[PDB]
Design a protein around this ligand. Structure first.
Ligand SMILES: O=C([O-])CC(=O)C(=O)O
Lengths: 435, 435, 434
């Protein structure tokens, strides 16, 4: 039972559905476009297809039909530790199936042999000024390893075949996913930990070895495992996942595609929310609460003034999520058990109480509820990841699991180039009756 | 006169129009989306807004409402050369106005002072293996300079505001546009010309200095002014312009945005058609045509043999264009004028006569006509730019002209994060009634 | 056809709206259900949805937003005649758009080629005893023709698709509507006019050909076009429209649905009032007015005798109307023009004046006002349609317009099987506290 073989089977079962949908039901209508939506970032238009994950606006994110709680129970657990192998979650995103112990082990052995970082990636990151933002460094590392692309080599030797193209894409995906934790770790060490490095430990799994290379003791190994599974995918319309998909649709390899994707995740409106919550809180705990865990009342009215004055409670909104986020939920369950007393956690817990009441009552706030990055930071800070800018790197490692899975499938199914049609301000004006 | 102040003026007049389309005419339907389109990468969906350029299927591209012939006619010319200052085209894309001679001079002077490459860019490209692909190097060079982003510093200093965000965007666009030719030339010299560098001549325009730094004599300066102007923009739905737009919509700076864009342009379905066309012609001449420019009738039968056996004619057709590309036309006039007796151009000319009737009869191709990529290669090769992989880097340099103008406007008008909605196969199958 | 794709166009726009209400606001309360209403036939419960027409208690019926005056006014008229093509009304009911002259003409051509009666319908009707009530013959004729159902043929060959199911429903609607007047007219000749049959004239409009085949001269053509439009629909909760809806909600075809429709319309409390009115007027005229148009006074006193004897003035009252029926209004307009001097009409007219005041001030009848069943009879009798039982067949042909339009949408919008919940008397007694 091997991943690539099983993946071939699933691809063989899935192709006729796609073919059918095109041949028999091509012109069936699924949505409309308004002036509002064209000007406003295609907001809400159903115009992309993925099966890796689906984001219900009411129910949370599902990974291959499963729920977060389901995924966390079903995936084989790392022995002597509490969370699943991340490699098992990748097996699941790739195939649709929960892996057995036996199947996880095989992927994890595969990751161990693909995990080493090319020495020239380090050369490049050293030549880039050390004051460069970690996400720029992370994107660069990815880009430089485009030299190693099996998909690019396949294409340039003239081997392109629409049926087999997924095979080198799968190879590139396994290689890149194996290496991202090492690349992130290297960036962490070189910028923030005095440029001393802890070697990869061949016996550890992906998340375990990330914790190791980061230089953080148990239970950070589980913090990482959980964090990456949680950030693994949020369907394909988020900017990072979409950016990867889009670039890849031109048959650019994954190195190009995921580098481009990290350029999107770097954006303040996409990858910064975890840290901005945490800085908001700390500052609140500082100025507005005399350096101390407050009480329910105090917090209740703190919100109201911040609201009344044209300010937003951070990490309590979202463009697609309309209910509470179950990624948020899994973080808590972890916090409640591992750091119940941590001062910062106590404030994110209490915030859970009041702020839904106030936005529900104030009105509007189409999403009057917490998204994941309302929680992620307090866990990181607890364990001594204080370097805020780096948080987005952790996001990038995680999000690759679903995006690279997605890229394999884009190629398996021959999804065509993404090339919408532009219109001018004048054209919109016509269609609106203006003159 | 001054570019920044005129740009301000144009923004302050445009902003109410967008406002109005949103405020009054928001839910006006402009298009619909079918199952075919979700699966077929959004083909045809009118879901993006730009005023920089507009791609008309029949007429091709208009830059700020001007046709290619009237752009080349109206833009101020470099003294002692045939072609316009690329800096003038840039002014036109930013403002909508055709600049006076005085107005281009001050854009040329501004670029002269923003032209120099950060030394660490050269350090970075040297650390990257020398056998790395030139587009990988080009993307990397761009990305490394994200360190200088005024937009990023502005955001990180807490200065973000929807009225002023265009300003540091413009500064970053000006900085980066000024340097892109030097970045490309550095890559050309370091890879292909023995790693000897020709210094910038502070007395040349962008086009002339690019030929200087490449080490190519007149009239390659004109080849470059024309090439870059023709490749400047193809509205915003093309993968590279779209990638930059999408990434910048999360408030990622132009460096992140344009590095991402070049990752998409790297793609064989986006940035390779030039070299692939040229290789095809040269191979065809060698094997099928006994190393000689054929007669009309000999080439008509080679085309049909090729079309009958399951092949395609490279550089013909397009996902949007439905008639002859006016970019192809402008390249032809240059070729006719400058290299009539060139063997490769001859085949290109004859192809232009022979191929459209044959493709039209068969009605396989929806655009049975050439695009620019049918023509660019023979001109490059004629002046001794024989390094096929580098052709795309020339594209990158040109395309930044419209894409960076576009990011400035995106920020001016406050266009929101791009976040369309994904649906699964199961969901398409439900909508199709095959639940 | 231009009709079929105009309709495809409306459906594709209207479906997201329906999904939205389901998907987002599906738990929003719309009304409540009291023991009274459960016992008394769902009286006043807002449990059905339709867009073909809406019945306002006060203003009465609107067809696709439009009132009766407006509909009569806007619909293309027949050359040489007063009234609209009924085809025109069908288009409007289907599409929602008032039709151009060309649009009306395309429906009329479509009906002219769909108009011919299967010979086995005639065989079946001849085998039914000639003394069978015309509504039974009517419902049987419809039912027999479910052999031709395209919608059924499409179900049986595995081709059902929730997106495409409206399309064969539409074909059947067009096939059946095109035939209903011919079926009606065959029943009329075979029973009442010596079993001799005037052929269909393929140059005539639906209503003109009906009168042609019935054997009645102008202006019976206009009587019919008017009659059919006015009876076209009365939203979906009336027993005939509801029966068809209910039956088709189980994905029975329109032949099954409308046959069932006509079984309900057959009922004394739904399709008989027109005739029961006209008889009672005839009686009264003969055995209470010395066979002559009374004075206003003579008749104001007659209404009270009858009432205070525990009798009802038929053709007045309604379970939903609460003011005067605009259907009644329109019939009256026609009468005043064409038959002012008719004795029976003159009593209908007088009645119009004296009955509401009495009924109002008695405070008993919740609709102290006429409905259309108060008027239709005098018109039919005036032109020599004396055969009382057959009136309800006229209603059937009429009411198909709106109901078959409605079934196309039911399938278009994919409405589920109508299946409410039953409760015992005991349970009602428990929710009463006994
Ligand atoms: O609406 C009702 O319940 C009865 C009626 O008047 C009609 O069917 O036209």
């Amino acid at each position: 039972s091997f991943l690539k073989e099983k993946l071939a089977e699933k691809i063989a079962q899935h192709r006729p559905r796609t073919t059918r949908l095109l041949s028999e039901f091509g012109n069936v209508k699924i949505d409309e476009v308004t002036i509002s939506q064209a000007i406003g970032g295609m907001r809400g238009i159903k115009s992309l297809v993925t099966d890796i994950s689906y984001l219900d606006p009411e129910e949370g994110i599902r990974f291959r039909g499963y729920t977060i709680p389901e995924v966390l129970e079903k995936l084989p657990k790392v022995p002597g530790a509490e969370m699943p192998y991340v490699e098992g979650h990748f097996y699941l995103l790739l195939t649709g199936d929960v892996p057995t112990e036996k199947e996880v082990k095989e992927v994890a052995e595969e990751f161990k042999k693909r995990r080493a970082l090319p020495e020239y990636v380090k050369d490049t990151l050293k030549a880039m000024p050390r004051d460069t933002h970690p996400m720029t460094m992370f994107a660069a590392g990815i880009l430089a390893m485009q030299r190693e692309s099996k998909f690019a080599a396949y294409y340039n030797a003239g081997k392109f075949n629409k049926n087999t193209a997924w095979e080198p894409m799968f190879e590139d995906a396994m290689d890149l996913m194996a290496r991202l934790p090492s690349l992130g770790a290297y960036i962490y060490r070189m910028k923030y930990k005095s440029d001393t490095h802890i070697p990869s430990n061949p016996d550890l799994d992906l998340g375990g070895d990330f914790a190791n290379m980061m230089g953080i003791d148990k239970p950070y190994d589980d913090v990482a495992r959980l964090y990456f599974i949680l950030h693994s995918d949020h369907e394909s319309g988020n900017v990072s996942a979409h950016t990867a998909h889009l670039v890849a649709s031109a048959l650019s390899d994954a190195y190009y595609a995921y580098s481009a994707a990290m350029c999107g995740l770097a954006g303040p409106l996409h990858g910064l929310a975890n840290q901005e919550v945490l800085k908001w809180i700390q500052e609140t705990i500082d100025k507005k609460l005399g350096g101390k865990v407050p009480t329910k009342e105090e917090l209740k009215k703190f919100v109201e003034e911040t609201l009344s004055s044209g300010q937003v409670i951070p990490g309590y909104g979202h463009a697609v999520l309309r209910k509470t986020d179950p990624r948020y939920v899994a973080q808590r369950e972890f916090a409640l058990k591992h750091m119940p007393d941590d001062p910062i956690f106590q404030v994110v817990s209490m915030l859970y109480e009041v702020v839904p009441p106030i936005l529900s009552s104030l009105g509007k706030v189409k999403d009057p509820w917490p998204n994941v990055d309302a929680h992620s930071g307090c866990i990181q800070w607890h364990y001594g990841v204080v370097e805020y800018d780096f948080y987005t790197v952790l996001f990038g490692i995680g999000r690759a699991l679903g995006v690279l899975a997605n890229l394999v499938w884009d190629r398996a199914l021959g999804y065509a180039i993404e090339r919408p049609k532009s219109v001018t301000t004048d054209m919109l004006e016509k269609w609106a009756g203006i003159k």
